Amino acid sequence: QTVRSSFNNINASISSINAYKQAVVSAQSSLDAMEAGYSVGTRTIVDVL
Amino acid sequence: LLGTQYISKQEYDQALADAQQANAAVTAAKAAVETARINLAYTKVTSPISGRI
């Protein structure tokens, strides 16, 4: 049970990374939609932060 | 709130529209008074010469 647990934890944790690494790419793009959005003025400085 | 935070200059300028736009709407209505003022106090005498009636 223990060996399969960690092996099925790390298989979860790899797919966890390629979730939360994609969740960076969202929240990097959503930030960069703000920095391009605040530099032109559509979104404010608080929607940036 | 310009320069500082929330106003997000376009959403200011969407209201800077509406001031500049509805003040222009007043200019329509202030002249619409003025057309209907020069149909109210436009009664009559004289024709703008000054002479003997």
Curated annotation (Swiss-Prot), chain A:
It is found in: Cell outer membrane. It comes from the Bacteria. Disulfide bonds: none annotated. Disruption phenotype: Cannot grow on efflux substrates novobiocin or fusidic acid. Changing R43E: Partial channel opening. Increases sensitivity to vancomycin, by allowing its passive diffusion across the outer membrane. Homotrimer. Part of tripartite efflux systems, which are composed of an inner membrane transporter, a periplasmic membrane fusion protein, and an outer membrane component, TolC. The complexes form a large protein conduit and can translocate molecules across both the inner and outer membranes. TolC interacts with the membrane fusion proteins AcrA, EmrA and MacA. Forms a continuous, solvent-accessible conduit: a 'channel-tunnel' over 140 Angstroms long that spans both the outer membrane and periplasmic space. The periplasmic or proximal end of the tunnel is sealed by sets of coiled helices. Outer membrane channel, which is required for the function of several efflux systems such as AcrAB-TolC, AcrEF-TolC, EmrAB-TolC and MacAB-TolC. These systems are involved in export of antibiotics and other toxic compounds from the cell. TolC is also involved in import of colicin E1 into the cells. Belongs to the outer membrane factor (OMF) (TC 1.B.17) family. This is Outer membrane protein TolC. It comes from Escherichia coli (strain K12). The lineage of its organism: Bacteria, Pseudomonadati, Pseudomonadota, Gammaproteobacteria, Enterobacterales.
Swiss-Prot record, chain B:
It is found in: Cell inner membrane. Disruption phenotype: Cannot grow on efflux substrates novobiocin or fusidic acid. Monomeric in solution. Homotrimeric; interacts independently with AcrB and TolC as well as AcrZ. Part of the AcrA-AcrB-TolC efflux pump. Complex assembly is independent of an efflux substrate and appears to be constitutive. AcrA-AcrB-AcrZ-TolC is a drug efflux protein complex with broad substrate specificity that uses the proton motive force to export substrates. This subunit may act as an adapter protein that links AcrB and TolC stably together. It is elongated in shape, being long enough to span the periplasm. Belongs to the membrane fusion protein (MFP) (TC 8.A.1) family. This is Multidrug efflux pump subunit AcrA. The lineage of its organism: Bacteria, Pseudomonadati, Pseudomonadota, Gammaproteobacteria, Enterobacterales. The gene is acrA.
